[PDB]
């Protein structure tokens, strides 16, 4: 009965030379029982990408909530929300439920359309912003991901090289966690093109 | 506890207490065992200086250790009961742990082991 580790799952994000990458596993389980291998944890609102780990019902609820809020934002502002602004919206929304929080570990990733600067950020369940130059990790194999990223990562990686680094970080972290795995997805994000790749990994 | 080494070696290399125990066997009533092609037969002597005996209740010379093994003896009658009892207990203990009744060799080996233990234990003959 630990909300954050009932369903399981992981998300990781990285920066590169004029690009960002965000990746997640596909597992949804009920403790030991694997239930679904199609449960994607990364969503996007315009060009801003959001990954969410933790309790699956809250993952779904928050996705629907941020779609709701970014749609109204766009109608009133007459422009797409930027990663820096969206990061603040996520923090506000999570802290609004300070004493009854969503059991989640969200991760923002995207490129600012005006400045062109790559941006990533992470949060705890009550909305504390964790900004980073290099990488952000989240989920039941966060310890594993921290170890993989801290050793494998180097700055200013090209999109094609960055793909390899983030993928290997996720896969090898997922294989050392019982509640993560069962497939994986990687998003490579450039200024005006976004490639999505499904990884082949062990299915146990 | 009584500790005295009663069974000990002598200058000529004999253990007199064991050898004197054989004399007690030599005094005992005769017992014979003959095995055929598909059977074994145990014969036993009963001395006839005892009339007015009640043969219904008098301890029989041949004893069942299990349903498939028997034991006869010659020597001190009181001593034999102790060996028979130990043997019967070990027979049931073997069935309990191994889930199979004792072999005749195993049962013999156990009884013989008991007898040996009394030849180099303190305070016993």
């Amino acid at each position: 009965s630990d909300p954050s580790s009932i369903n399981g799952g992981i998300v990781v994000a990285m920066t590169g030379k004029d690009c960002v990458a965000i990746a997640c596993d596909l597992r949804l389980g009920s403790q030991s029982l694997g239930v679904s291998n199609k449960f994607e944890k990364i969503f996007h609102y315009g060009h801003v990408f959001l990954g969410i780990t933790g309790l699956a019902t809250d993952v779904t609820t928050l996705n629907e909530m941020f779609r709701y809020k970014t749609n109204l934002y766009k109608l009133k502002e007459e422009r797409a929300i930027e990663p820096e602004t969206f990061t603040q919206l996520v923090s506000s929304s999570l802290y609004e439920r300070r004493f009854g929080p969503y059991f989640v570990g969200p991760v923002v990733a995207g490129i600012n359309s005006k400045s062109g600067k790559p941006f990533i950020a992470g949060f705890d369940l009550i909305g504390c912003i964790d900004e980073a130059k290099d990488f952000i990790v989240s989920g039941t194999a966060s310890d594993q991901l921290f170890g993989m990223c801290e050793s494998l990562y180097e700055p200013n990686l090209e999109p094609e090289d960055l793909f390899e680094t983030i993928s290997q970080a996720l896969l090898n972290a997922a294989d050392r966690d019982a509640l993560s795995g069962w497939g994986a997805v990687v998003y490579i994000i450039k200024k005006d093109e976004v490639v999505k790749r499904y990884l082949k990994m062990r299915q146990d | 506890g009584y500790d005295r080494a009663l069974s000990i070696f002598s200058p000529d290399g004999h253990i007199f207490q064991v050898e004197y125990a054989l004399e007690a066997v030599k005094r005992g009533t005769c017992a014979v065992g003959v095995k055929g092609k598909n059977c074994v037969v145990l014969g036993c002597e009963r001395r006839s200086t005892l009339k007015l005996q009640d043969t219904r209740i008098t301890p029989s010379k041949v004893s069942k250790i299990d349903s498939h093994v028997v034991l006869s003896f010659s020597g001190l009658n009181a001593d034999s009961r102790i060996l028979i009892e130990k043997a019967r207990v070990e027979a049931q203990s073997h069935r309990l742990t191994l889930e199979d009744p004792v072999t005749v060799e195993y049962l013999t080996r156990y009884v013989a082991g008991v007898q040996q233990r009394y030849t180099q234990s303190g305070g016993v003959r």
Binding site: C128, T165, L171 | -
Partner: protein, 222 residues
């Protein structure tokens, strides 16, 4: 965390480390613990990270509105009063431990606030898990009539004590100087004595190392 505050001749200086933990794991190696309440009132925060940021922003927001309403520069005691009454109301459940400092028309000030809403006044203060390491240094080297440069040195030395000796604290030293009659200068990463050494090997993979099942272009446009 380790956070400190030190008063000097013509103002006050505050400092902080830059480690953010998640159990025994370092979540952020260079997080900012110095917060701006108003242009010349700054705040060092320890405890629950979300709470220190949220409570400092809320009071900062209300201070700005108050400043505009009264046509006056905000006072440190106003921020102090608003913070303590907020924290007290929540009976310690908002885990914010703050060192509040700044300059205003009354003068220069230095306070600390605890989660349950109690406030303290002092010439030198330290809060957080590494406060004992820091307070040891402050109690050893503090004196009356410190200069600006002496107070920065003392403050950063007190943070360093926390960085090295406390496992809760680490990485870099952030400083903010608030002098009377001058703009407050925020010295982000004032010291960086924990630079990561060159790695023994590059872990750049040959292209094609990762096995792929599907590719697809994602539509971000309308």
């Amino acid at each position: 965390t380790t956070i400190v505050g030190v008063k000097f001749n013509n103002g006050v200086v505050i400092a902080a480390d830059t480690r953010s933990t998640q159990g025994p794991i370092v979540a952020d190696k260079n997080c900012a613990k110095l917060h701006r309440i108003s242009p010349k009132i700054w705040c060092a925060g320890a405890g629950t990270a979300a709470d220190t940021e949220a409570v400092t922003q809320l009071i900062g927001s209300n201070i700005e509105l108050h400043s505009l309403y009264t046509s006056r520069e905000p006072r440190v005691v106003s921020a102090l009063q608003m913070l303590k009454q907020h924290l007290f109301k929540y009976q310690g459940h908002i885990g914010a431990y703050l060192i509040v400092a700044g300059v205003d028309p009354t003068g220069s000030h230095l306070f600390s606030i605890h989660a349950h809403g109690s406030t303290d006044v002092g010439y030198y203060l330290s809060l957080g898990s590494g406060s004992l390491a820091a307070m040891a240094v402050l109690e050893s080297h503090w004196k009356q009539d410190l200069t600006k440069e002496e107070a920065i040195k003392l403050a950063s030395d007190a943070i360093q004590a926390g960085i090295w000796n406390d496992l809760g604290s680490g990485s870099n030293v952030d400083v903010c100087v608030m002098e009377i009659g001058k703009d407050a200068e925020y010295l982000r990463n004032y010291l960086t004595p924990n630079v990561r050494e060159e790695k023994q090997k590059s872990y750049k993979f040959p292209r094609g190392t990762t096995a792929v099942l599907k590719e697809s272009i994602v539509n971000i446009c309308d």
